[PDB]
């Protein structure tokens, strides 16, 4: 049974690459992180920075989350991210994703001790 912090890592961290360099990145990564197992997760973002740099966002700019909670933080700097979004022709079990690489600020919700990211709110 996964902790919230571990689930964030599995769903959103890809430090091994600096950026998505292929249109098939999302297809491969959504599968290998087990996000297509029982359903196609419709949207997911991967962050290509070190785990320490992402954890550090919990000490950056405190902002409201989309749901109105106040434990969200926006990174001071932009970060390399990949947005993965199901295509209109995607349907389980043959999940298919569009890969969009960008450099944006990330907004995460933080919780716990240590205070670490548990939810990916948005990128700007
Ligand atoms: Cl897993
Ligand atoms: Cl996401
Ligand atoms: Cl402030
Ligand atoms: Na946790």
From Swiss-Prot:
Disulfides per UniProt: 26-84, 40-95, 58-110, 65-72
Keyword Hydrolase: yes
Active site residues according to the UniProt entry: 12, 119
GO terms of biological process kind: defense response to Gram-positive bacterium
Cell compartments where the protein resides: Secreted
A GO molecular-function annotation: RNA nuclease activity
Entry GO CC: extracellular region
Tissue specificity as recorded in UniProt: Pancreas.
Signal listed as a keyword: yes
The protein's Enzyme Commission number: 4.6.1.18
Catalyzed reaction equations: an [RNA] containing cytidine + H2O = an [RNA]-3'-cytidine-3'-phosphate + a 5'-hydroxy-ribonucleotide-3'-[RNA]; an [RNA] containing uridine + H2O = an [RNA]-3'-uridine-3'-phosphate + a 5'-hydroxy-ribonucleotide-3'-[RNA]
Binding-site list for substrate: 7, 10, 41-45, 66, 85
Keyword annotations from UniProtKB, A to Z: Disulfide bond, Endonuclease, Glycation, Glycoprotein, Hydrolase, Lyase, Nuclease, Secreted, Signal
Glycosylation sites per record: 1, 7, 34, 37, 41
Functional summary from the UniProt entry: Endonuclease that catalyzes the cleavage of RNA on the 3' side of pyrimidine nucleotides. Acts on single-stranded and double-stranded RNA.
Family statement: Belongs to the pancreatic ribonuclease family.
Subunit structure: Interacts with and forms tight 1:1 complexes with RNH1. Dimerization of two such complexes may occur. Interaction with RNH1 inhibits this protein. Monomer.
Name of the featured protein: Ribonuclease pancreatic
Gene: RNASE1
């Amino acid at each position: 049974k996964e902790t919230a912090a571990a689930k964030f890592e599995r769903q959103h961290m890809d430090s091994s690459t600096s950026a998505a360099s292929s249109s098939n990145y999302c297809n491969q990564m959504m599968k290998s992180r087990n996000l297509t197992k029982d359903r196609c997760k419709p949207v997911n973002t991967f962050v290509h920075e070190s785990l320490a740099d992402v954890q550090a966002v919990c000490s950056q700019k405190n902002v409201a989350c989309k749901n109105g909670q106040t434990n969200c933080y926006q990174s001071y700097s932009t970060m390399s991210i990949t947005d993965c979004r199901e295509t209109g022709s995607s349907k389980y079990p043959n999940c298919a994703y569009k890969t969009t690489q960008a450099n944006k600020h990330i907004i995460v919700a933080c919780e716990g001790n240590p205070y670490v990211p548990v939810h990916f709110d948005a990128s700007v």
